[PDB]
């Protein structure tokens, strides 16, 4: 099966094309890291995928999405994974880590708490930024503050510093954050960059954040191990082509600028939108990616059945299939998917204290 | 739903009647646990299930199964466990643990190394004892020492010292393995113990280790958490009717001495016997010892789907289901159960940051 097959990018192989993609947790504290976190990657890395990437992790304080995101923006918390990181490889999954900023969508509450930007006199909360001071709006209507250069600077340091964290706690995998609305995302799309200095207005000034950011992480991250982005390439709000056309043009510099795999997703940068969810949906715009920017990539939101991932990856949409609520259901989900196609001696997708006995 | 229903014992409260059951893992080392107990434990505590019992944990040296065999012959080895103990008892389970001497069958390689006795020149084995100097023969063909009285007051010290340390160690639920053939079982069984002292010949000779072991455990153990063990009631050797008889009997005996619940199970004690492995097989037998001893049960060995497991509480066959191997196979088992049988809000089996996304 095309599921089960490794694959090789770099330096870097996985034993299978089953990623975990990175899922918030919400359960750190200060930034922190602890054993929510450790007993949940290792659990899952023993599950059988062959990558696991570690949840949206946040460059500075500010760009928490909530009080419970996991941060990298010290020495401090990026200790805290060295044990995590260590777990995984010891599963024979690799290791990945998203590293974040949540822009305009900052500094709200946690999913099962309300969902929505922090209130005013909560001490919890904090002042988000932003290309432009224009508030997403319905659940999150805190208008954020307009970055200055000196920011934009700021911030592109942090995501060199926290790569080169990420780098130094013995991650093989990292993936830059510039998809769904957070800070990346919104200086490439139109309705949330109204900036008239060089980081807005033309494609190449609404790409540039992304741009310079993705050059200076390479100036640390090891050329070596994977070096890979999620990026939103529509949004399903009547401008879809248009901006499926720029999209896959900044995908094309993406690669130009080293590159080697993208994550392909919905932009969630409005919230006046009509997505349509359905299983495996993503698929043909995943491959209209994949084909006229010739990058590798993966996707999501909705290929969580083994005949789909399956299915995906013989198309060629896809080259590895990231499943995600899935493996919340089931941390062993890999086990399940190679049951369900036949492969031979699935139960070893597991350890042996767990393969013996399912044989 | 029957499963989903809690259940009070002593003064410990599980949240359901499921219960994972003593499963060795085989990755200790000089009996010393580690981050994949931890891992393995506290992932299946979040998965739901109201009771977590650890592995057969050897009360010494010589009774661990295999050189991978957990141990609490030692403060240090009790020490190990309080991390997760701590984190079962995050997750809202009950931390159990069972306490073991594999008598004769001790000293034997990893189910996935062979399954059989270490051979004579490895230098990873060692001697075993017994009641009697007699092997289980087959793949277990090493002679064990017969015990002296000194030896049989030893390992009752040791079952005694290992209790204190689980309580100690924060430890909610106590198991003694008087099952699978292990020592206790085998000083209760006529073909291995053969035995003309105090401890052999009559059934109350026989039963005479196990009563005075429990006796003695009962000293240390707190009379408001629950103090179980796990006994063999039949071997399906052609002496079925007459062992189960006796085995009631002992139960009784165990009730009047403190035994607030019993795992019942099947001897293992020698290998030429006719099991008839089917789903729930073990219902009606569970079910006979329950009504004859007048004392709560679990069982286990086919129980591992959602609507076995509640009719066998329905037809108040079980107090508790044991469910192993299907835990292996997905350690949110608890949360399948809960979506098959139609359990109100069935995600929040699991804790938030999976049941949010599940719902
Ligand atoms: C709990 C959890 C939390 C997150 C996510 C999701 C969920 C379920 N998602 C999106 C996720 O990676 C994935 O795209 C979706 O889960 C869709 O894939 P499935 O349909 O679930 O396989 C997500 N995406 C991301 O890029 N970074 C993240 O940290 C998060 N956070
Ligand atoms: C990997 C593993 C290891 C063990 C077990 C089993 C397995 C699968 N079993 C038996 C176990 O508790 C249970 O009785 C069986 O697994 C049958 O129940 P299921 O059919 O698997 O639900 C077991 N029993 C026991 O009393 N102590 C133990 O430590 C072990 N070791």
Redo the contacts between chains.
Sequence with gaps: SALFEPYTLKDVTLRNRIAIPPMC???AEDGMIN??H???L??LA?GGAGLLVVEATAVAPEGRITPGCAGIWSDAHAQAFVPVVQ?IK?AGSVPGIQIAHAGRKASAN???EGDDHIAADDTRGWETIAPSAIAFGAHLPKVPREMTLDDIARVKQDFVDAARRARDAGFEWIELHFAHGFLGQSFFSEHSNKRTDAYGGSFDNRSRFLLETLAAVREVWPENLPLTARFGVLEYDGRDEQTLEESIELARRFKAGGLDLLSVSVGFTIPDTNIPWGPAFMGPIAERVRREAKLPVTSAWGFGTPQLAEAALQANQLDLVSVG?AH?????WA??AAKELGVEKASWT?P???????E
């Design positions: 947790q919400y359960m054993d929510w450790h007993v949940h290792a659990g023993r777990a010891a946690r999913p099962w609520r919340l259901a089931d941390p062993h086990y399940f597991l042996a204290p767990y393969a013996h006995w399912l």
